[PDB]
Symmetry: D2
Subunit: 464 residues, 4 copies
């Protein structure tokens, strides 16, 4: 009896049985992912693939991990957020002999150490050759601290909008060292996960964090991209009176037409940095503000100062700097209600009255509230995102960028999206998971609209 399998760090390995029970259910909610697991078990298309994975260690990610593993891959995994892991999921994965370094409630130190444990196997760089990322933190660390490892990696498959944006910055600046597939912009990812996932999981997380009635109350959603669209619907369908802020007038136009009043935190929309710019009458009526932008400081200090007493503040974008929580740590006393729920007392820094009425309620300390305060998106939604993740991993691994002459590396050095035909094939398995029946074009019909009977049914410019 030796030490045994120890290449992992989780909160509690004994939760594994529970995580496995939840993985087994989740499999039945993920027909596109499990169809790939079935269709590709033979080809072992990921045999020899050695995947650095950095994405929220949820049950849904566990079904993704095991699908890569079932297709031949070796993986070393960490979560991409300190609060997003489900400890029973992490424990279930570690119990299956898979290296995972993830728990709910990491410090920032532990977060970076966890990523480090995927990168280093046994004190030396693992011979990684694939990267799966969500937000780009693992991507950044590899480029800035382990560039030599990038010499052996065939590509990066990036999950989310913020991560894609960081990739494009690096592509533009000549600093991206390996090609990448933008998974986010599949329609079965962006207009499934980003919108409908937040529709499901935002009011989920707010109810779990606060158990606040939402009906009848006033919400301000900052942003009306895919996340903001889904977020606004999560709140409006519960009966909130939802107001939407935007910098993109096309997105603002959509919110008006979807039945929202479009407002700005600042008078005439001009954020001059002074308190006098804040629409105090507006913020003084808001019971809930949700940031969804991917931007920085969209719920700033002066807004926080002016919010209605006891309003709930949260962020469902990727990074916590959407809210100026730094200002609130410096100036206001924090009272933990329960994990990932704090009352922030605007009375001052040092201590608070337990019955002070002048406080805000912050969820997940500003981190992604759906994963921090609930369980993120549901399996049937994540099915689409992770089916794309698997297809993209298969494809970049087969391309073998790491094995090519230097000058064709410039030709392969690109951020690409999966082809629409693949997008549609994932869509079809999703629809069938609902019991939906897709109609087949007749040849005359296909000829009439200029498509093949088998698709793709839309040009790449089609917006859906």
């Amino acid at each position: 009896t030796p030490a045994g399998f120890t290449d992992y760090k989780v909160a509690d390995i004994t939760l594994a049985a529970w995580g496995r029970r939840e993985l087994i259910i989740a499999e039945s909610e993920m027909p596109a992912l499990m169809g790939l697991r079935r269709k590709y078990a033979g080809q072992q298309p990921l045999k020899g693939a050695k995947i650095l994975g950095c994405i929220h260690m949820t049950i849904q990610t566990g079904v993704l991990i095991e699908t890569l593993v079932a297709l031949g891959a070796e993986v070393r995994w960490s979560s991409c957020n300190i609060f997003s892991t489900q400890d029973q999921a992490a424990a279930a994965i570690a119990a299956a002999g898979i290296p995972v370094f993830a728990w709910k409630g990491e410090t920032e130190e532990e977060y970076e150490w966890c990523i480090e444990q995927t990168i280093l196997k046994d004190g030396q760089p693992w011979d990684a050759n694939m990267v799966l990322d969500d937000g780009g933190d693992l991507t950044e660390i590899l480029h800035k601290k382990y560039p030599q490892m990038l010499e052996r990696i065939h590509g990066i498959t990036e999950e989310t909008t913020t991560g894609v944006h960081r990739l494009l910055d690096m592509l533009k600046n000549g600093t991206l060292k390996v090609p990448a597939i933008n998974v986010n912009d599949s329609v079965t990812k962006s207009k499934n996960d980003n919108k409908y996932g937040c529709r499901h999981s935002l009011n989920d997380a707010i109810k779990r964090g606060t158990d606040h009635l939402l009906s009848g109350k006033q919400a301000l959603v900052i942003g009306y991209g895919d996340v903001g669209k889904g977020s606004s619907q999560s709140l409006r369908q519960e009966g909130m009176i939802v107001k939407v802020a935007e910098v993109d007038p096309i997105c603002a136009m959509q919110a008006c037409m979807d039945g929202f009043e479009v407002v700005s935190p600042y008078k005439n929309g001009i954020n001059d940095g002074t308190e006098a710019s804040i629409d105090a009458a507006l913020l003084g009526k808001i019971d809930l503000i949700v940031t969804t932008t991917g931007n920085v400081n969209v719920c700033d200090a002066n807004m926080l100062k002016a919010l209605k007493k006891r309003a709930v503040v949260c962020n469902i974008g990727h990074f916590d700097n959407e809210i100026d929580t730094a200002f609130m740590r410096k100036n206001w006393a924090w009272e933990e209600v329960k994990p990932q729920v704090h009352k922030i007392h605007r009375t001052g820094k040092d201590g608070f009255d337990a019955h002070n009425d002048d406080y805000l309620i912050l969820l997940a300390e500003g981190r992604l509230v759906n994963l921090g305060n609930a369980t993120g998106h549901p399996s049937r939604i994540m099915d689409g995102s992770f089916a794309n993740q698997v297809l993209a991993q298969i494809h970049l691994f087969e391309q073998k960028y790491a094995d090519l002459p230097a000058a064709e590396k410039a030709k392969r050095l690109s951020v690409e999206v999966l082809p629409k035909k693949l997008d549609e094939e994932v869509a079809l398995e999703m629809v069938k998971g609902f019991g939906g029946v897709v109609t087949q074009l007749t040849p005359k019909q296909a000829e009439y609209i200029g498509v093949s009977v088998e698709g793709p049914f839309k040009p790449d410019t089609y917006r859906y």
Copy 2:
């Protein structure tokens, strides 16, 4: 005084039409902002526009915006049933040639387009085309190629019109460049979707006055029009099922809370009655086609529909339903204009109290324009501000005057730049009293955009 160059139902409707145009102007801030911004420059001075789009009150404000910016125009409707006669009469009384009335025959429809093309029996000195559906575009290519030599461009309104332009382009038959106005977000995701949300249940109420809540609807298609049409019915309380051939669109319908079904067992349309899901169709109270495709509500479907179901089409062309089969096999009883009971008992005559009929709206033509007034002004504001910008752009490019070599480089179908799309959107938002936030310089840097936009890459789907 002395203006006679027009054909409308009743010129005495002009004072009424004018009252409604003055109202609609207040509902169209982007179109009216363009009028104010460009009146001094006269960017369309010398433009001579053949226009073929639904002669509604909203098209009136478009027409008069083009004119106010310097253009002369000759106008026809792009559907036999979509004209509002008071709008046509107001435009005629303003001295603008228009050939349009509600309830044209097909022959009269073709004649009206020809009256825009010919002036005093001769080709008009047109140099710009504004089209909706491509009917005018097609006539110019097939019958008046010499006129296209002097035409600088086509600004095409609708998905079906764009598809026909692209077919010409791939075939080398497109003679002048086009702007695809449909693909602006302030057109496609405003007009196509939200316009149909507003005007679909509108037309069905005017046509039948049927309660929709609690009743079963089948929407064929879940593109932009299908999405908005589904919402039109679901927000009224219908139980809406959606059919699609595009699994991505089907997936959206699922996620939007709709059951996705096919008219055919396992979705396999093999032309046989036996393929029809008769249990499904025998429960449907309302079928709506939204596809731009052919025969998506076919004869066997029509045979299987529940008795007294409503049948309608909000796509551009009436061949979405097999109305030919119904004319050939079944007796038509007019309820009122644009509303027919179609008795499945036979062709010759019908029992006035027969229970086995369907209710066809607008004879299968676009139901929102045929049985109501189409999209509202505040929505058409976006589409038609795009039209004006597109006319301004193609006219100023002066393709017809370019040397053959330069024409060849410019013969394409293009969309308006995102910056303009955004500028139209902003005026619309301002028309709701919305307040767009300005990025600080730091945030624009953070997300990699200018403070003034555009805010999204062209790949962004919204």
Copy 3:
């Protein structure tokens, strides 16, 4: 050689008949009563004065009464609510009807009198069917003698019920009545769901305004206000709700509406200072639904956003201070039942004046004024009750009974819940719904009969 009618255009009859035949397929409860009671002829000998909106739906009610044996003489209960093809179709069937769309106030009162009189002198009516009590009022206040041979009244709507109860409490009510409104298959089915269907319907026909994204103020949140609010919200309007009833305001909140008052702090003190001018200057659409008086008052009308739409879906047109508007501001007809009210003055207006309001149906019932009111499948519920109520009062034969033994009969009563359920069951079947049948053990467990009624009369649904 039938001449005992007055309609706009009798040549519309064939059109009206086509819509009647369609409506019949949309009214299974009414048509069910036709087949159920055709044999019995329960209204044989009934002579019914009827005063209710002369729509296609009312036509099906009329011809249901006749199919069951009744003779009727009919008029509308609003000057703008008649559908002229419905009136014409009824007249063409040899049924006396006096109604057109767009009557004057004078002609409305003349049409009622023509039902009351037959061949120059009072009809020998023995039944009354009323929608707002105007006909009832005229029989009590001007024909207190015809009332002696009538076996009852059946009042259709909330307002008219209220007017009967003020007579009851004051002991001035003279024949027994049946409140048809308090049936759930009438009250909810109609007052709420009917306005859900027909309010935005009317606003679109009248204005063709996009509603999505715009600001509405619904005054009132009773059944009409509830259905009105949903009609606008389901279109994407941002709807605010005003109420004096905190319980209805509570429901508006819970339904996801912001509850506001036109007056600062809700205190309507008659001054221009009390008006929340900031709120009113943002409102694109105000809809009154209260049955009360002056809930959209002159000061609110002054403060409304330019080009706002103003309408009333309550029974009477004093909900809005239209009188102030006639006295002070110039009216421009856009088209029938649509007027631009110019706040620049009374002495004419500039055609391009931007400071105007849009008033629908001159403040009258907007859904019947600018569209066709409620749909057949909804009116089915109310009129099936009306038929049952007429049957019950006719067969009870009040006018043929001892003097004040009839005091045990003098009452405003509702219909038995079992009847309410029977109507509801026919309506559900019209949707193809399938009602589940309790097992004996189940019915014992909750203490009801397998046959119903399933709720006590206190249940609020």
Copy 4:
């Protein structure tokens, strides 16, 4: 600290419970307004209240309101799974006898009620009863008639409890008057409907994390609870069908845009598998019982449900689902607390990867309280304001002190006056920032009401 008259799961949870109570107080303006209105008057001084209701944070605020008004209480939960342990712990820590934890056995549940009834082995000097579901009321009548002699009244929270009260009255077995708290509109239409709207999908998400959008639900019942439950699922995008025995309620579901179906062919429950609509049941992903009835999701429906469907009950008692059949016949795999997979492959063990199972939430117990936290504070504010008023009213009536002749005249089940209902409503509305309009004198005269209310007759249904 000397105080030991309680039993909770973990007393160290008290500080957490207290933090959540302080927050809930800010969400319960009506309850906290009663506290401020009556604190000086101490209208419950001398009241000794047996309370049996879900020992949540919201009930914690109610308990402390009663105490603040002068009452002493002894408390138990009315369901084995509904206690929030941190709420129980905070109440115990304040020196208030409470016997409640999440996860009780049935025997523990009974013991907890008895610990409120008995103090130091003898009947407590109880003189008021606050009940939710009738269980404490039942035990008092069956087992402690001597105590009822001294009790002035029962304030019953929920529909099922009121029914048992009415049966006892009808039978002559009710020993003390009761106030039906459920029947206030600020209870029935606030709590029963909008509460289950909030908390049903809440519980289902916490329990299963299943996507609901796009999936098929069958809700049994369309009363207040069923109305709220149907809305809870539809607003998430479920395709919701509704079953009912009451045709009026089914009519409401139709008009609300739901398809109305029966588990049984033509609605006829004949007791055999042959009478099951297996085609319908084979499509349902989620069934919710809302009836207060027995066996409304019976063994033959459970056999017929689509594989892996979720089964749950939001009615007061767990016999709405034939969970007893499932225990006799099928294998239960606990996923996590209050979530069980129920394997239809047999009674003895299961394949860990069997696909033919159902998901039962809270073992058939009220799912909103069992798998989440029940209704939110701002909703329970209305219910519990009514409780406090009902307790005040009966305690001051002092029925137990009246002569036998006066008792006979007051032995009834009453509801609170509408005026009070409105006063609770006004406080709830103010908590939303709502501004109620005050009638003018002439307006109040016009509709025949006082300016202060009541505004509706008692027959008004809202």
